[PDB]
Paper text:
Pseudomonas aeruginosa is a major gram-negative pathogen responsible for a variety of infections and possessing an array of both intrinsic and acquired resistance mechanisms, including β-lactamases, like the chromosomal Pseudomonas-derived cephalosporinase (PDC). β-Lactams are the most widely prescribed class of antibiotics in the United States, and antipseudomonal cephalosporins (including cefepime) are important therapies (alone or combined with β-lactamase inhibitors) for P. aeruginosa infections. Taniborbactam (formerly VNRX-5133) is a novel, investigational, bicyclic boronate β-lactamase inhibitor shown to inhibit members of all four Ambler classes of β-lactamase enzymes. PDC-88 was chosen as a representative member of the group for detailed characterization and is noted for a T289-P290 deletion (by structural alignment-based numbering of class C β-lactamases, “SANC”) in the R2-loop (ΔT289-P290). Herein, we focus our efforts on PDC-88 to better understand both the basis of this expanded-spectrum activity and its inhibition by taniborbactam.
The active sites of the PDC-3 and PDC-88 structures in complex with taniborbactam revealed strong electron density for the bicyclic boronic acid inhibitor. Taniborbactam was covalently bonded to the hydroxyl group of the PDC catalytic serine (S64 by SANC) and made extensive interactions in both the PDC-3 and PDC-88 active sites. The boronic hydroxyl moiety of taniborbactam in both complexes made hydrogen bonds with the backbone nitrogen atoms in the oxyanion hole involving residues S64 and S318, as well as with the backbone oxygen of S318. The carboxyl moiety of taniborbactam interacted with T316 and S318; the amide moiety of taniborbactam made hydrogen bonds across the width of the active site (with the backbone oxygen of S318 and with the side chains of N152). The hydrophobic bicyclic rings of taniborbactam made hydrophobic interactions in the active sites with L119, Y150, and L293. For PDC-3, residues Y150 and Q120 adopted two conformations in the apo structures and only one conformation when taniborbactam was bound. We superimposed and compared the taniborbactam-bound structures of the Class A CTX-M-15 (10), Class C E. coli AmpC, and Class D OXA-10 (34) with PDC-3. The major difference in taniborbactam conformation between PDC-3 and the other three structures is found in the 2-aminoethylamino-cyclohexyl moiety. In PDC-3, this moiety extends away from the bicyclic scaffold moiety, whereas in CTX-M-15, AmpC, and OXA-10, this moiety points in a different direction, allowing it to make van der Waals interaction with the hydrophobic atoms of the bicyclic scaffold of taniborbactam.
Numbering used by the authors: 3 to 361
The structure:
Amino acid sequence: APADRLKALVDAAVQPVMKANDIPGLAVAISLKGEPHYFSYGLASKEDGRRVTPETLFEIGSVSKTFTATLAGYALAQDKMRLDDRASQHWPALQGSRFDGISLLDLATYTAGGLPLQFPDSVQKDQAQIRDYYRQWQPTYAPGSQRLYSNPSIGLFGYLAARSLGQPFERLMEQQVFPALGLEQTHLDVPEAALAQYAQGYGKDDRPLRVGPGPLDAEGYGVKTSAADLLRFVDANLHPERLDRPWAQALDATHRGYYKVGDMTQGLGWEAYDWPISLKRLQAGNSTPMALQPHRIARLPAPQALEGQRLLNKTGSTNGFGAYVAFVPGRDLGLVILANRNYPNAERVKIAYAILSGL
Ligand SMILES: *[B@@]1([O])OC2=C(C([O])=O)[C]=[C][C]=C2[C][C]1[N]C(=O)[C][C]1[C][C][C]([N][C][C][N])[C][C]1
């Protein structure tokens, strides 16, 4: 009955949203009282009819920023950097730029002063173009005043964290972070031997879409992982104390809120809400205006522990994929929803809400 109840609950949440958004395949993973549960739907590739499993690789887009924050947490834990460090202390090519006046915290939390959603199309994945972009950049407003969701912002934060550790970002992620987290199905660059597991993404007219190279892609949106591995990451977030001490500290650094915008408390990577809260309020916190418009922040007097009766979440999108992760620390509850369509965030939250309410 409990298997049937749980399959009934997840089916009732997922199936209508998959039909309504024409999602070819979707993988759900739930952590409930320290037990994993997997629900797999539809097709990883329509063309060959490969089915979604808990080992299928999906692009998770901006959920990658929670990994980036974890590498920064590790640099913090090892005293290689501090959140109030000036950005240019960690990259000489930025010295003399406006990044002399911008903290790592500002970049991490999108408050550096109007760094845009994306690098402009003119900036390719090239070290010199990225250096020249940041050197010439000027804030639109005061650092620390307005949140504007930004790849270049948290991207630079992860790149500087990696420089502080004396190694490239992508090497640190593959050689240190993923192994420390027990993640063997999590990739920035999918190995040839694992390509059979990589789902096809679908956009308008079902055009096939896997993410192409871009400046600080790894930092902003580069992760491919399975529902099984992303739920392991969620379980590490729910129990940092089970990891070796420096990684425990790295994960705790991602559970600290610095400011509020509406119902949302901004941490490093993770965005937090009180729990319970209405579905409409959780959808609004993950809405298009929150991604695309600047918002004045309400700074907290001291960083707040993101634990207890709160929901921590992150949405992630690429042109072909739509991911959502959410966990409730105080209820030992975790959830991963990976899909091979970029379907609206409101719809991803609709599935999660139905599941989390059901439990
Ligand atoms: B990220 O996934 O977060 C994000 C959301 C969200 O939170 O779900 C909504 C809207 C935008 C973003 C930004 C992030 N994702 C990307 O930046 C998408 C990425 C950008 C580069 C593209 N490549 C261009 C081709 N040369 C691929 C999509």
